[PDB]
């Protein structure tokens, strides 16, 4: 199937019509997405098949055809861009200054942008275009607004 | 079955729409990968 680097929609024909359940990143021959998008199931890319290679429910991440390749990190200071790919809508870059998720095991960057559930797996980028994490796993704060973590994996 | 469809290049767009705030939140992460607010 298509192995070109870039952002991709994760679609399903199991439900009514064709539904977008998420988004992912193709880089160095590996497809990267959030675990809750695919639940670890196999993926199709045209006539080709993508098999899961690594996954973790707690990190909420999964890679296909090879190990996690994305290792860029938010510098904790500058604005970033969410390359949002919403269901049935064109890819669109949104600039924001990330907030902070303070946890017992350290701080994580967070993006306060609200999109449909099927936008999960959309990449967050630095000024150099490097993917610093995926959008789609977060929390719903007091005023009902959505704040996602900047979820990044580990390159072995 | 699930399938992928290309949607674009991953590039920084100069003069993209600038929105969203930056909240500092105390959060907890459980074994199921669910984030929750700590108060
Ligand atoms: C009031 O809460 C709104 C929705 C936002 N949701 C999203 C948004 C983007 C990506 C993934 N999930 C989680 C469930 O709540």
Tab-separated table of N, CA and C in Angstrom, chain A residues 2 5-11 13 18 25 37 43-44 50 57-58 79-81 83 93-103 112 125-127 129 137-138, chain B:
chain	number	residue	atom	x	y	z
A	2	UNK	N	0.223	2.403	0.400
A	2	UNK	CA	0.955	3.665	0.431
A	2	UNK	C	1.872	3.768	1.638
A	5	UNK	N	5.696	9.060	3.703
A	5	UNK	CA	5.651	9.802	4.963
A	5	UNK	C	4.492	10.826	4.888
A	6	UNK	N	3.827	11.068	6.001
A	6	UNK	CA	2.699	11.988	6.024
A	6	UNK	C	1.659	11.606	7.050
A	7	UNK	N	0.562	12.365	7.078
A	7	UNK	CA	-0.555	12.164	7.983
A	7	UNK	C	-1.654	11.401	7.242
A	8	UNK	N	-2.306	10.459	7.925
A	8	UNK	CA	-3.305	9.596	7.308
A	8	UNK	C	-4.534	9.506	8.170
A	9	UNK	N	-5.683	9.309	7.527
A	9	UNK	CA	-6.931	9.062	8.250
A	9	UNK	C	-7.043	7.539	8.478
A	10	UNK	N	-7.602	7.151	9.620
A	10	UNK	CA	-7.883	5.777	9.992
A	10	UNK	C	-9.395	5.650	9.887
A	11	UNK	N	-9.844	4.930	8.870
A	11	UNK	CA	-11.244	4.747	8.500
A	11	UNK	C	-11.763	3.334	8.814
A	13	UNK	N	-15.275	0.654	7.683
A	13	UNK	CA	-16.544	0.444	6.986
A	13	UNK	C	-17.488	-0.516	7.742
A	18	UNK	N	-18.722	5.135	5.666
A	18	UNK	CA	-17.296	5.043	5.983
A	18	UNK	C	-17.099	6.050	7.097
A	25	UNK	N	0.456	8.843	11.804
A	25	UNK	CA	1.648	9.364	11.145
A	25	UNK	C	2.495	8.246	10.535
A	37	UNK	N	-7.678	4.244	19.034
A	37	UNK	CA	-8.184	4.363	17.665
A	37	UNK	C	-8.396	2.949	17.029
A	43	UNK	N	-4.357	-3.211	10.057
A	43	UNK	CA	-4.799	-2.115	9.219
A	43	UNK	C	-4.577	-2.471	7.761
A	44	UNK	N	-5.357	-1.870	6.899
A	44	UNK	CA	-5.244	-2.083	5.471
A	44	UNK	C	-4.781	-0.763	4.827
A	50	UNK	N	-1.022	-3.871	7.240
A	50	UNK	CA	-0.125	-3.343	8.243
A	50	UNK	C	-0.430	-4.109	9.516
A	57	UNK	N	-1.352	0.187	26.226
A	57	UNK	CA	-2.628	0.787	26.622
A	57	UNK	C	-2.426	1.975	27.571
A	58	UNK	N	-1.423	1.922	28.462
A	58	UNK	CA	-1.217	3.011	29.419
A	58	UNK	C	-0.677	4.268	28.741
A	79	UNK	N	5.498	27.952	20.996
A	79	UNK	CA	4.238	27.524	20.410
A	79	UNK	C	4.484	26.294	19.504
A	80	UNK	N	3.439	25.520	19.292
A	80	UNK	CA	3.473	24.299	18.491
A	80	UNK	C	2.286	24.356	17.511
A	81	UNK	N	2.183	23.375	16.609
A	81	UNK	CA	1.041	23.278	15.737
A	81	UNK	C	0.387	21.911	15.811
A	83	UNK	N	-1.696	19.514	13.729
A	83	UNK	CA	-2.077	19.300	12.349
A	83	UNK	C	-3.324	18.422	12.462
A	93	UNK	N	-3.545	23.225	9.971
A	93	UNK	CA	-2.588	23.515	11.041
A	93	UNK	C	-3.142	24.585	11.967
A	94	UNK	N	-3.083	24.342	13.285
A	94	UNK	CA	-3.566	25.265	14.300
A	94	UNK	C	-2.423	25.519	15.263
A	95	UNK	N	-2.038	26.779	15.453
A	95	UNK	CA	-0.958	27.143	16.353
A	95	UNK	C	-1.471	27.449	17.747
A	96	UNK	N	-0.781	26.942	18.765
A	96	UNK	CA	-1.167	27.151	20.149
A	96	UNK	C	0.045	27.090	21.061
A	97	UNK	N	-0.042	27.716	22.250
A	97	UNK	CA	1.022	27.565	23.234
A	97	UNK	C	0.523	26.508	24.203
A	98	UNK	N	1.251	25.393	24.329
A	98	UNK	CA	0.790	24.330	25.226
A	98	UNK	C	0.779	24.666	26.712
A	99	UNK	N	-0.201	24.109	27.400
A	99	UNK	CA	-0.266	24.122	28.853
A	99	UNK	C	0.581	22.986	29.427
A	100	UNK	N	0.342	22.610	30.700
A	100	UNK	CA	1.105	21.566	31.402
A	100	UNK	C	0.192	20.616	32.180
A	101	UNK	N	0.420	19.301	32.055
A	101	UNK	CA	-0.224	18.278	32.868
A	101	UNK	C	0.822	17.956	33.938
A	102	UNK	N	0.567	18.319	35.195
A	102	UNK	CA	1.476	18.006	36.293
A	102	UNK	C	1.060	16.656	36.871
A	103	UNK	N	1.889	15.608	36.693
A	103	UNK	CA	1.579	14.274	37.236
A	103	UNK	C	2.567	13.893	38.371
A	112	UNK	N	-4.899	22.642	24.527
A	112	UNK	CA	-6.304	22.915	24.787
A	112	UNK	C	-7.078	23.255	23.507
A	125	UNK	N	3.396	19.286	16.190
A	125	UNK	CA	4.704	19.556	15.586
A	125	UNK	C	5.433	20.738	16.194
A	126	UNK	N	6.766	20.717	16.100
A	126	UNK	CA	7.579	21.856	16.484
A	126	UNK	C	7.838	22.730	15.232
A	127	UNK	N	8.543	23.862	15.399
A	127	UNK	CA	8.832	24.785	14.300
A	127	UNK	C	9.606	24.132	13.134
A	129	UNK	N	8.961	21.103	12.010
A	129	UNK	CA	8.081	20.118	11.384
A	129	UNK	C	8.163	18.721	11.981
A	137	UNK	N	-5.564	11.973	23.754
A	137	UNK	CA	-5.750	11.386	25.085
A	137	UNK	C	-5.588	12.491	26.137
A	138	UNK	N	-6.670	12.807	26.823
A	138	UNK	CA	-6.647	13.881	27.794
A	138	UNK	C	-7.764	13.871	28.801
B	1	UNK	N	-13.210	-4.075	8.914
B	1	UNK	CA	-11.765	-3.847	8.888
B	1	UNK	C	-11.433	-2.351	8.810
B	2	UNK	N	-10.262	-1.955	9.315
B	2	UNK	CA	-9.830	-0.575	9.244
B	2	UNK	C	-8.806	-0.360	8.150
B	3	UNK	N	-8.889	0.810	7.496
B	3	UNK	CA	-8.016	1.184	6.395
B	3	UNK	C	-7.468	2.614	6.577
B	4	UNK	N	-6.280	2.895	6.004
B	4	UNK	CA	-5.689	4.228	6.050
B	4	UNK	C	-5.817	4.947	4.672
B	5	UNK	N	-5.881	6.281	4.709
B	5	UNK	CA	-6.065	7.121	3.503
B	5	UNK	C	-5.170	8.335	3.723
B	6	UNK	N	-4.257	8.674	2.785
B	6	UNK	CA	-3.362	9.823	3.028
B	6	UNK	C	-4.164	11.129	3.112
B	7	UNK	N	-3.763	12.020	3.994
B	7	UNK	CA	-4.420	13.313	4.222
B	7	UNK	C	-3.454	14.514	4.086
B	8	UNK	N	-2.136	14.284	4.049
B	8	UNK	CA	-1.210	15.381	3.806
B	8	UNK	C	0.200	15.202	4.301
B	9	UNK	N	1.020	16.236	4.069
B	9	UNK	CA	2.400	16.331	4.503
B	9	UNK	C	2.385	16.833	5.897
B	10	UNK	N	3.452	16.546	6.645
B	10	UNK	CA	3.585	17.055	7.983
B	10	UNK	C	4.579	18.202	7.878
B	11	UNK	N	4.064	19.437	7.840
B	11	UNK	CA	4.877	20.648	7.745
B	11	UNK	C	4.333	21.732	8.662
B	12	UNK	N	5.212	22.622	9.119
B	12	UNK	CA	4.792	23.748	9.948
B	12	UNK	C	4.243	24.793	8.931
B	13	UNK	N	3.060	25.369	9.194
B	13	UNK	CA	2.478	26.367	8.296
B	13	UNK	C	2.720	27.748	8.882
B	14	UNK	N	3.511	28.585	8.191
B	14	UNK	CA	3.757	29.941	8.673
B	14	UNK	C	2.473	30.736	8.485
B	15	UNK	N	2.045	31.431	9.533
B	15	UNK	CA	0.802	32.197	9.573
B	15	UNK	C	-0.428	31.291	9.556
B	16	UNK	N	-0.404	30.260	10.415
B	16	UNK	CA	-1.543	29.379	10.637
B	16	UNK	C	-2.437	30.079	11.687
B	17	UNK	N	-3.694	29.641	11.847
B	17	UNK	CA	-4.595	30.251	12.833
B	17	UNK	C	-4.080	29.995	14.271
B	18	UNK	N	-3.829	31.071	15.042
B	18	UNK	CA	-3.294	30.984	16.406
B	18	UNK	C	-4.420	31.074	17.451
B	19	UNK	N	-4.736	29.953	18.131
B	19	UNK	CA	-5.798	29.921	19.144
B	19	UNK	C	-5.423	28.968	20.338
B	20	UNK	N	-6.332	28.751	21.292
B	20	UNK	CA	-6.095	27.874	22.427
B	20	UNK	C	-5.322	28.499	23.570
B	21	UNK	N	-5.734	28.199	24.808
B	21	UNK	CA	-5.025	28.700	25.981
B	21	UNK	C	-3.968	27.655	26.480
B	22	UNK	N	-3.317	27.888	27.637
B	22	UNK	CA	-2.255	27.026	28.196
B	22	UNK	C	-2.509	26.717	29.695
B	23	UNK	N	-3.501	25.873	30.027
B	23	UNK	CA	-3.785	25.612	31.455
B	23	UNK	C	-2.785	24.685	32.156
B	24	UNK	N	-2.466	24.987	33.411
B	24	UNK	CA	-1.573	24.148	34.211
B	24	UNK	C	-2.492	23.322	35.112
B	25	UNK	N	-2.600	22.017	34.844
B	25	UNK	CA	-3.524	21.147	35.566
B	25	UNK	C	-2.831	20.015	36.307
B	26	UNK	N	-3.272	19.708	37.540
B	26	UNK	CA	-2.745	18.559	38.283
B	26	UNK	C	-3.566	17.354	37.812
B	27	UNK	N	-2.928	16.368	37.154
B	27	UNK	CA	-3.639	15.208	36.601
B	27	UNK	C	-3.038	13.850	37.064
B	28	UNK	N	-3.839	12.771	36.966
B	28	UNK	CA	-3.421	11.419	37.314
B	28	UNK	C	-3.656	10.494	36.128
B	29	UNK	N	-2.751	9.548	35.923
B	29	UNK	CA	-2.877	8.611	34.816
B	29	UNK	C	-3.054	7.199	35.388
B	30	UNK	N	-4.162	6.535	35.029
B	30	UNK	CA	-4.428	5.192	35.544
B	30	UNK	C	-3.865	4.092	34.594
B	31	UNK	N	-3.947	2.829	35.024
B	31	UNK	CA	-3.473	1.662	34.296
B	31	UNK	C	-4.177	1.491	32.959
B	32	UNK	N	-5.435	1.954	32.840
B	32	UNK	CA	-6.159	1.877	31.572
B	32	UNK	C	-5.814	3.010	30.577
B	33	UNK	N	-4.869	3.880	30.929
B	33	UNK	CA	-4.481	4.994	30.070
B	33	UNK	C	-5.423	6.188	30.141
B	34	UNK	N	-6.308	6.233	31.148
B	34	UNK	CA	-7.247	7.334	31.298
B	34	UNK	C	-6.687	8.414	32.209
B	35	UNK	N	-6.718	9.656	31.730
B	35	UNK	CA	-6.306	10.808	32.521
B	35	UNK	C	-7.500	11.324	33.314
B	36	UNK	N	-7.252	11.773	34.534
B	36	UNK	CA	-8.283	12.351	35.386
B	36	UNK	C	-7.716	13.545	36.163
B	37	UNK	N	-8.583	14.492	36.578
B	37	UNK	CA	-8.140	15.684	37.309
B	37	UNK	C	-7.934	15.403	38.792
B	38	UNK	N	-6.822	15.870	39.348
B	38	UNK	CA	-6.531	15.702	40.769
B	38	UNK	C	-6.909	16.990	41.479
B	39	UNK	N	-7.816	16.925	42.457
B	39	UNK	CA	-8.206	18.131	43.191
B	39	UNK	C	-8.129	17.931	44.698
